Write a protein that binds this ligand. Structure first.
Ligand code: PLP
Ligand code: PLP
Lengths: 387, 386
């Protein structure tokens, strides 16, 4: 493949490139914010979409035995994890699945534990459904995030806590939790009667031979209290297609999740979604393995550059994915001022760290899912941003 | 060109590939679920190729020119002025109905519908802890009419908060008159009921029938209505999951958005964003060519039914490609009618059962197909009835 190839994305109705005016107040800044890549989907996906377009009929389209086998086959090949086809419910996206899972496995007024800072919709899919966020803040220990197990046990044992949403890899930072972290979390959740939603959407994008451990893979018991959200969207840059496989080995939990879909008038995938998730999990491998190497070399360049040129900026090197959580605390600036210096003076758009709630103060997130050249330009824009 | 023979077996089509699971047969001609056996308009497939060639499928959002396409259609096809601020995108009309029910009622509230009607109307009320209240349709002159005296009684009940209008009405394809709609609006305005109008059959007006959007009739009506429109039935693209929901009243639009956010919805897929624009922008003449082919298909059905199966009363539909067929005069049970159709004739209709009360003795025949496929359908219906 050829990730250095320069793409024009202006005028493609791209949220990342075309909605900067609406969302940031600038038209002339390099977009490096929302988590989508600047790359063409693999040819293995587009071949098969063009094939679906050629048939020319776009009526009611359903996933089938071969769609499920591509999901199962992929999880066994990439992650060593056995999934029965029957475990899989499709969804138009993982944020939808987060919402459905909240509605299915908790009551109005329950508490849901998350580990902040974290992906913003975790807050929204709990708060907007009249459930309550209880935070288990992560600890910064040695330029990497660690889980605080003493706080978690205190939080998980309150009787109104019925759900825990795990982000693994964690967004932001790209932290890949250890087997032992998951085992400790799992046992606490069994003990305290807490269903686990595992958001594993970044889990294919593992850097430097970091190993992903799907929570549900660890025991029967874990499998029976888990809802794993997986998707080709981050892995193959096809968020645009609204395709998710949600894995729920417990029949009763699956039926409750399905019921939430039915109630809200959902359960269909669009016809392109159905082609895309079969092609992606069938023939995506080789392209992913070239993307990892490409992202590794992008991450080595950002680390090289910041530690040399910007020594007050502290970069968490991610274990996975193409998003870099960056610490600008040392500059003593408001989040309001940091962002204006990036927007007006560097001409670059990063995600402001306050988006991710407590612990996001003084950080911003940088989308390194672009050609080396675009990354080098953006790094220079961050330096420029700071006098 | 609608006479081209089109292969749909092996294409993950619910209609053609899910018969074994849903009807217990794989050797029958499927003429049940409401999608067509035709290629979409070239105006949509050509714009789809453009987005495919660009080769990147990240987060894609509707823009002003998407909402303009929608306002262009409603102005050009209907004479309805729609401000872009009024449009909220949804992945589907069933999704919209669920959202409307959750946004505009309380649990325990009663929701009026006119049976027999599209099955999801019942599910999206009952499954959400709301109560279906029937305003049954009367058969008069072999066509449906509204029972306004019964309707007035029911809209008066104070726990009734929502009316779900099907216009055109599935099943039957009935296109409600200006007069019908003015009287319905008056009652809901009188009794503080919110009107959800499913208008998804509204662009396939046959034989000079004219669709009247509820919302178009006055500011009073606009402001209590939720209009669910889509290109999906009109252009055979239900599998691109695109729809446009028109809420002129800003407060009800806010509550409807809030139901979409709450459910982690709001986004359209990249192809839907393309498809809805192209369809409402450039689909006009392909649709006129389709109205004409449907009209021929209906004429053939009426001619064949009046001559070869005169016991069958066809409701000639005002709109869409779905034929509501009364098999009463045969005296088979609903269950024997379906086993005869599926096992003897080896053809699949929608059993009128599923549409609720007023549905017994009926089945719905899908004529959205080549005249050849329809003639094979009618031949199999006659074989089933011997
Ligand atoms: C980007 C992202 C998502 C997005 O899910 P969709 O399927 O695109 O709705 C969900 N979770 C995490 C952690 C993400 O980073
Ligand atoms: C087919 C049909 C629908 C389904 O709409 P989607 O866009 O597929 O959700 C809704 N309403 C009526 C009356 C229909 O006939």
């Amino acid at each position: 493949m050829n990730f250095d190839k320069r793409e024009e994305r202006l005028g493609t109705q791209s949220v990342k490139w075309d909605k900067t005016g609406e969302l940031f107040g600038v038209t002339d800044a390099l977009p490096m914010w929302v988590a989508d890549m600047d790359f063409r989907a693999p040819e293995a996906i587009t071949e098969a979409l063009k094939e679906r377009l050629d048939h020319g009929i776009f009526g009611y389209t359903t996933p089938d035995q071969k769609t499920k086998d591509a999901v199962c086959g992929w999880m066994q090949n990439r992650h060593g994890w056995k999934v029965n086809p029957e475990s899989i419910t499709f969804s138009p996206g993982v944020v939808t699945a987060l919402s459905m899972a909240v509605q299915a496995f908790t009551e109005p007024g329950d508490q849901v534990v998350v580990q902040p800072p974290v992906y913003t919709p975790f807050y929204h899919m709990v708060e907007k459904n009249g459930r309550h966020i209880l935070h288990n803040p992560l600890l910064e220990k040695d330029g990497a995030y660690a889980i605080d197990f003493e706080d978690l046990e205190t939080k998980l044992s309150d009787p109104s806590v019925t759900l825990f949403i795990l982000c693994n890899p964690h967004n932001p930072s790209g932290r890949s939790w250890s087997r032992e972290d998951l085992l400790k979390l799992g046992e606490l959740c069994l003990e305290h009667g807490v269903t686990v939603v595992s958001d594993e959407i970044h889990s294919d994008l593992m850097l430097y031979g970091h190993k992903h451990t799907p929570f549900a893979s660890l025991s029967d018991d874990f499998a029976d209290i888990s809802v794993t959200c997986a998707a080709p969207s981050k892995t193959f840059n096809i968020a645009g297609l609204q395709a998710s496989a949600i894995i729920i080995p417990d029949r009763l939990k699956r039926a409750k999740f399905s019921a939430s879909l039915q109630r809200n008038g959902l359960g269909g995938l669009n016809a392109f979604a159905v082609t895309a998730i079969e092609a992606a999990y069938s023939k995506g491998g080789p392209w992913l393995d070239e993307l990892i190497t490409y992202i590794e070399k992008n991450m080595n360049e950002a680390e090289a550059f910041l530690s040399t040129e910007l020594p007050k900026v502290k970069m968490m090197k991610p274990d996975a994915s193409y998003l870099i959580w960056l610490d600008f605390s040392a500059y003593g600036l408001s989040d309001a001022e940091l962002q204006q210096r990036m927007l007006k003076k560097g001409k670059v758009i990063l995600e402001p760290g306050t988006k991710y709630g407590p612990g996001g103060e003084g950080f911003m997130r940088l989308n390194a899912g672009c050609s080396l050249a675009t990354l080098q330009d953006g790094l220079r824009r961050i330096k420029a941003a700071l006098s």
